[PDB]
Amino acid sequence: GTSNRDWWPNQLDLSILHRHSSLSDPMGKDFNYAQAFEKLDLAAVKRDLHALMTTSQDWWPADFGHYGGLFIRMAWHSAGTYRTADGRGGAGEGQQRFAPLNSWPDNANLDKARRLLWPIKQKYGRAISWADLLILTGNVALESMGFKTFGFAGGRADTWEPEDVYWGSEKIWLELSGGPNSRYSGDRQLENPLAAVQMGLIYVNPEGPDGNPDPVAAARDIRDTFARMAMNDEETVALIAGGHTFGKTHGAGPASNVGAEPEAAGIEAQGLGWKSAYRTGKGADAITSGLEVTWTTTPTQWSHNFFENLFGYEWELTKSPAGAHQWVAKGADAVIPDAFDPSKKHRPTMLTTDLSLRFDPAYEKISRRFHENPEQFADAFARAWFKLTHRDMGPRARYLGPEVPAEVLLWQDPIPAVDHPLIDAADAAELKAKVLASGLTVSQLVSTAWAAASTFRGSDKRGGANGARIRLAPQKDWEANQPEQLAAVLETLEAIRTAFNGAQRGGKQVSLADLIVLAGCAGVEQAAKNAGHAVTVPFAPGRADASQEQTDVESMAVLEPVADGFRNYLKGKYRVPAEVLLVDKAQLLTLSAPEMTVLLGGLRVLGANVGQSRHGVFTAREQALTNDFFVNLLDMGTEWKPTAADADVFEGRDRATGELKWTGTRVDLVFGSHSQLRALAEVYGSADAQEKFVRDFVAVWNKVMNLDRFDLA
Amino acid sequence: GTSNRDWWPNQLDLSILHRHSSLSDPMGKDFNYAQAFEKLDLAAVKRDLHALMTTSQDWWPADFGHYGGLFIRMAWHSAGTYRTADGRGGAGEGQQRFAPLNSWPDNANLDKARRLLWPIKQKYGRAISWADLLILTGNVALESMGFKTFGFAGGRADTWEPEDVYWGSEKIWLELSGGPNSRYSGDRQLENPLAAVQMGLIYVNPEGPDGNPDPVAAARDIRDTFARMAMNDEETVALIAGGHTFGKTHGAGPASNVGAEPEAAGIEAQGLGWKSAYRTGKGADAITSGLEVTWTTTPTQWSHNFFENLFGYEWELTKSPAGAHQWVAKGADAVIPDAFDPSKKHRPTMLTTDLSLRFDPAYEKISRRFHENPEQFADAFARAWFKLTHRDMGPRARYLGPEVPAEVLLWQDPIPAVDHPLIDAADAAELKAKVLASGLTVSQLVSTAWAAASTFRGSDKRGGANGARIRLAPQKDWEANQPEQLAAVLETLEAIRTAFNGAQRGGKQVSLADLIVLAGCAGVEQAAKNAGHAVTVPFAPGRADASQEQTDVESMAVLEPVADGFRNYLKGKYRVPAEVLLVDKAQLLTLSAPEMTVLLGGLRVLGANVGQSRHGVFTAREQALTNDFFVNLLDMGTEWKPTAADADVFEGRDRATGELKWTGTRVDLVFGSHSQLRALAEVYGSADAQEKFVRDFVAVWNKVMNLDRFDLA
Ligand code: HEM
Ligand code: HEM
Ligand SMILES: OC[C@H]1O[C@H](O[C@H]2[C@H](O)[C@@H](O)[C@@H](O)O[C@@H]2CO)[C@H](O)[C@@H](O)[C@@H]1O
Ligand SMILES: OC[C@H]1O[C@H](O[C@H]2[C@H](O)[C@@H](O)[C@@H](O)O[C@@H]2CO)[C@H](O)[C@@H](O)[C@@H]1O
Ligand SMILES: [Cl-]
Ligand SMILES: [Cl-]
Ligand code: NA
Ligand code: NA
């Protein structure tokens, strides 16, 4: 059946903005997962999980009689898809249970792991999501095998369909680099936003880069992909060594015995995949990655044996039974237990990527320190496991349950608690009047608030106006934020704030974070008055101001907008068309296509463009809140053509005289070209639509201002 | 960017069930198009359209100074996508303005026609939909040129995204038959549900079949395609000759001058396409189809000159300036006006498909009658043009406005007016108890109500339980409806009805249509009571009973369910997997994926399967409304394998003993295989889900019962 995507494979796809509708969700519109979870008996769930660990099922027998290793890997993979570039991936939406991740080759036999958890899921129902369950299970595995975890938070609501994530352009699973859709160029430069070295891998290739078993070269891939997952060297060594203290790999026979992945299997497989024709197909005969490595002498107990083995032997390159490259300890005795036969032992073995931890010079120093000081290794692994499994959960306000760690961590982008009375509606009116009397313009007020609030992304719930981090490094220096203009607005608002705060009694005070947002609201109100409309814009106080020392400057760098179509901004020339970048940003902001449309049209006429660019400013009454963008964009009296100097800028001329009326970018004109977008533009550019435009704009503006407000949720 | 569709091109697509979310709709959740329309000043809209017809725009100059012909073709193409097989296509959703229809080759330059209408659309805003305006414009064209239309109804609400329609499997526009994805097999048998001869055509090829200019053979394709759009021979001749009384074709130069269709065009084209490098690219130089034919001596006035020319001349095969086959009158004078140069005239010309009307023997008889009696022609055309443009609008209750024709037409599947008081809540309770006391079983009551209500399809809003057409030919004899069992249930309910109606005062009575649905409600309540749950199923009276004489038996044939996964029914062996046919039925029913899942799981345990098949009946308490379908389907203690006799039937055996527990079809087991469906089955198969299952089942049952109830809108 030929589809629009077949005919026009480069047209923009808006269906990413209308995922996650109430149509696909089986839960009622009022379901609130936080409330369900807070009534869960978490202790009962953990007892059931502890029981499960050693309750072997014959259809996927437990190695060493204990599923802990399999579950740790399951959780680590759940979390391990995360990319700091866009925040997408991670454990936080339980997407391991949907395509494509349920069928990635690196996720082989994690279908079995999830199936073992069905009876617990069924027992507790809506009170524990799959997303929370996967992580909780990892934690229980660790605790069952003697490792004390740093804590656990619930609150990852389940999702009901696959996320639209760019995982790469390759058309072959696991394709090595340098092909027609290579994710690598230059000196092994991985394309943003990717965080894995081959299509269908979590981070790196366990044999080495593109299969080449060189631990030093593998270390480079480890370091880059883990940095792209928000992990530094210490955290990386702690995680890999900690993980590989447990369990084993599976490669008992040739890979060609392994059948279809779950999304390709037959209906009778009932959601499972990788059925193997090798011997019994399971247990002692299991084939998962094709490697056959058992790291420690006690694979079901926390030990300091990983680093004893890594440093205590010299290693020789060998092959598993499936033909994969791995390493065996020279001259060692058979000290490693077998997973099924008590009369068998094995020599110590390692992956290429384990040896990276010894042969990369920067890892070797950390590895040695951990070998010499195992308490340091335990604490670092516990912290890094927490970070790994919570990195995408957002502000601490979203953490639920009785095991949330009290300690505030820098990676959480923490916001200080509010400890004083908040401004009321009378105070808000008085502060908006002060802001309007200061001489700040609609353009400056709107731009500043937009800059502050539109750093939010729903993918990992980072960013937003809470914290007033716009005033700190590095946000205050981002080019899209217009640093010199921003400084002048912030100095004015800070003087207003100091004067209001110094006049108060009690402990009442306003944060700069709230004032930035409030001042934006005053700008929108003033713009509406400029247009002859009487509008009050909703405002909710309670933001607090974070400090510089609570703001990790290197972690904040990924939130920098290099493309922000809402301000007609593009930092450089990219291979992705700017209107695709617009849709991508709207998805991060949680906007639908009508919301994106309305917002952008209003921002253009309010003066939100970076550098006061006239591109898309299709009005003769700038700083007034009108639907002029749409009415002028749709006027057939204007003809558009790309300019000779720049194929991405367009000139709109009167059709009868040739006279220049406007200029616009791709982001501007897509609203008059894309057949669905133009349908939405038409609604707002109709003669009956001015009051609808204003009200819809105010609603979307408010939505953006509140995106990070989980304190109010 | 590689997508799930790329990796698993044959996995089932559920996104067709989640279109049309409130996310994608710019109108508020409360917007009611009927209420907006009813306040439109339709007379003022028509005066503006009348003025437009002769107000030429220089970017697409009006042929003969009059846009009437262009707009008639626009409206005909809007309606002309309709197929009776599934009800999809047609004018009723305004889909001509979205992909792919906006860029079909047969729709070339209708982009210009729609653009001409933007000012009027903009003026009237939400009070007139694009979908209504397309049709209205064609009526006003006809009226302005001297043709009296049969009437006009508003009420086609606009849609905001493309419909998911199977338009064929060809990967090349206009591909000739006999390719690798041929829509023809056997002796020129067009595959259901298609109703056009080539990908991107409305009906047929105007040169002849696969380009062969033989009028006799073209007639065969005309007759088949028009029958598949619900038009008979009389209506077909009236439509084609009526349309071709007006306007002209456009083929002034070679087709290679014409550039990309709108979905492929550059962003600067602002939604238009087919930009032509031939001379001025428009007006006298226009190229649309490649043909260059002007049918009558007065292209901007209704006449009987099409048939005068068709019968008054002999025709010679010739070529247009673009090289297309077309026909010219032998020895004729230059009597046809030129569209732009008043000093030039041309000979009469015809399409191959026009000559069909004279050279096919059955058409010739109708065409002669019309030639001899042009008042007969005018009436037939007016009736057919109304039918064409309203055939997908649904029940007459959805018609709006002051020009709705009072005459009731058989094709409308009409329902008599109700002229008596309706039963009240107490009456309904009395009837449900009488039905339960009669000895009819849950299975009989559920199955009968399902059979009556589930003929509805949202594509053309035909079918449903209103009318009680289940008691008439042909529904009473459809195999899926179990004709002997149905007859027994209907005799019982009719006796209950006669006894209740005979006892009443004041003219209160209950229709059989209402009682069928109420009896089904009683069944569902009783099933719930069987499970230990007291529920009342909502019921809304006001259905009426249609007569056999008000039911067109041949038209009703396309509503027969040959595949109804909800009753585990497949009439024959198809090349499309049954699970695909389930999702297609769910889309026709207007169900989401959660609604489809709940509904199916409940129907299985209520006894709704055709023939009392045990497939999917995963319960030991049949006729009790429980979630047993899901809890048993998801039980990992059962292993499933295809049977040796039939690969589409599966046995579920206990994994440990081998004992046979269940059998199921692909429609049953898709819910335990598809990763999105299984996530939905999990919610209903959880230990906390019995109350939720019952409530959601009752809600979707009631939705299905009410699908045709536009009297309550
Ligand atoms: C460079 C990073 C890493 C690489 C290349 C990697 C590679 C793999 C491979 C290939 C397997 C074998 C899969 C199979 O055949 O069953 C595996 C197993 C496993 N990994 Fe990793 N790993 C990495 C990091 C992690 C981290 C960060 C953790 C957790 C903190 C983890 C925990 C596990 C555990 C527990 C297993 C054993 C599974 C079982 O017992 O069934 N690994 N690893
Ligand atoms: C066998 C069925 C049909 C065939 C093959 C067919 C074919 C065509 C083609 C090839 C053109 C020229 C497109 C262009 O070059 O501008 C056209 C024009 C047109 N057709 Fe048809 N047609 C059919 C039926 C109908 C029907 C049912 C009607 C309406 C009742 C209709 C009304 C018109 C009108 C009014 C025009 C002139 C458009 C103009 O003036 O711009 N046709 N036809
Ligand atoms: O984090 C330290 C400090 O950074 C900024 O310093 C400001 C100053 O407070 C402003 O009011 C204005 O004069 O510009 C300075 C330029 O560096 C923050 O604005 C401030 O809240 C924070 O304490
Ligand atoms: O059985 C189908 C049939 O049922 C009802 O008609 C009754 C009729 O009213 C009685 O006289 C009875 O003894 O015979 C029929 C039952 O066969 C439906 O209302 C009717 O339209 C339908 O044919
Ligand atoms: Cl994601
Ligand atoms: Cl459709
Ligand atoms: Na994420
Ligand atoms: Na339709």
Structure description:
The structure is a homodimer of 713-residue chains. Chain A is mainly alpha-helical. In chain A, strand 5 (336-337) and strand 6 (345-346) form a beta hairpin. Helices cover 37% and strands 6% of the residues of chain A. Chain A contains 24 helices and 12 strands. Chain A is globular, with a radius of gyration of 28 Å. In chain A, strands 3-4-7 form a 3-stranded antiparallel β-sheet. In chain A, strands 10-11-12 form a 3-stranded antiparallel β-sheet. A two-stranded antiparallel sheet of chain A has the order 1-2. Chain A starts with a helix and ends in an 8-residue tail after the last helix. Chain A has 4 domains: 1-167 and 373-407, Peroxidase, domain 1, CATH 1.10.520; 168-372, Peroxidase, domain 2; 408-564 and 689-713, Orthogonal Bundle (Peroxidase, domain 1), CATH 1.10.520; 565-688, Peroxidase, domain 2, CATH 1.10.420. At the A-B interface, helix 1, helix 6, helix 20, strand 10 and helix 23 of A face helix 1, helix 6, helix 20, strand 10 and helix 23 of B. A molecule of 2 linked components (GLC-GLC) binds at residues 471-472, 491, 494, 548 of chain A. Chains A, B: One of its GO terms (molecular function) is metal ion binding. Chains A, B: This is Catalase-peroxidase. Chains A, B: It comes from Burkholderia pseudomallei (strain 1710b).
